[PDB]
Amino acid sequence: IERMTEIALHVFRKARAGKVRPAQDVRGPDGNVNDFLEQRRPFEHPNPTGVTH
Amino acid sequence: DFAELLRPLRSLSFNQVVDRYVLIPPNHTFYRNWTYEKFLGGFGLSYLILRELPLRNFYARV
Ligand SMILES: CCCCCCCCCCCCCCCCCC(=O)OC[C@H](COP(=O)([O-])OCC(O)COP(=O)([O-])OC[C@@H](COC(=O)CCCCCCCCCCCCCCCCC)OC(=O)CCCCCCCCCCCCCCCCC)OC(=O)CCCCCCCCCCCCCCCCC
Ligand SMILES: CCCCCCCC/C=C/CCCCCCCC(=O)OC[C@H](COP(=O)(O)OCCN)OC(=O)CCCCCCC/C=C/CCCCCCCC
Numbered sequence: 675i676e677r678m679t680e681i682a683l684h685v686f687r688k689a690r691a692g693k694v695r696p697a698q699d700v701r702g703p704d705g706n707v708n709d710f711l712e713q714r715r716p717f718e719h720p721n722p723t724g725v726t727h
Numbered sequence: 728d729f730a731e732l733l734r735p736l737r738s739l740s741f742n743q744v745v746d747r748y749v750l751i752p753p754n755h756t757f758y759r760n761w762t763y764e765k766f767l768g769g770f771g772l773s774y775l776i777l778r779e780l781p782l783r784n785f786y787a788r789v
Contacts, residue, residue: 725785
């Protein structure tokens with residue numbers, strides 16, 4: 675049951691990370707390195723609570 | 728123009744002038760200071776509308 679659990683937990687971690695970043699191609703759930711490049715807030719949803727600069 | 732300032736007086740007698748412009752019946756029930764409350768109070772009402780400006784940049788609204 676120890677071996678079965680770590681197999682399911684490894685799938686769970688990849689599936690959990692896939693919810694915020696879905697799977698587009700063969701790379702799988704959360705398999706895109708470009709997602710973690712520098713990103714900015716959209717123009718229609720700026721920072722509502724504080725200053726940006 | 729000096730004769731135009733006296734235009735509403737030439738059509739009236741002295742008794743009518745006194746009753747019209749001098750002997751105004753006393754009525755101390757009016758909120759005379761509403762003129763100032765509306766004017767100066769408009770700054771606060773204008774701020775309620777102006778604090779919602781869709782200018783995205785924070786320093787632009789500054
Ligand atoms: C149906 C679809 C749409 C179709 C219609 C589209 C067209 C709409 C226009 C026609 C309908 C308008 C309705 C009102 C009729 C007014 C007619 C008129 O002649 O007014 C001229 C009016 C007054 O001219 P003014 O003599 O020069 O007086 C202004 C001076 O600043 C005064 O300075 P002051 O020093 O001499 O005096 C200080 C002043 C205080 O004045 C100030 O401090 C303001 C200073 C401005 C900020 C300083 C920065 C100035 C920057 C300069 C550049 C500004 C350019 C802005 C251009 C704006 C163009 C409109 O305090 C007062 O004197 C008294 C104020 C208290 C008045 C009581 C408030 C009653 C308002 C009506 C209540 C009900 C309306 C609904 C509630 C409001 C909407 C939520 O001109 C203005 O519009 C002034 C701007 C006011 C902001 C308008 C925002 C409200 C617009 C409402 C739109 C509808 C609501 C949204 C509905 C959305 C779904 C449809
Ligand atoms: C302001 C609070 C509103 C809700 C109140 C809830 C509580 C209710 C309890 C009220 C108890 C009443 C106690 C007595 C209050 C007396 C009121 C008073 O003194 O002022 C009245 C006085 C009467 O004026 P006079 O003719 O000179 O005086 C004659 C007197 N016989 O009223 C005024 O001066 C006018 C100003 C009063 C407030 C006006 C509110 C204006 C708000 C503007 C929004 C409306 C939209 C306007 C759009 C314009 C479109 C062209």
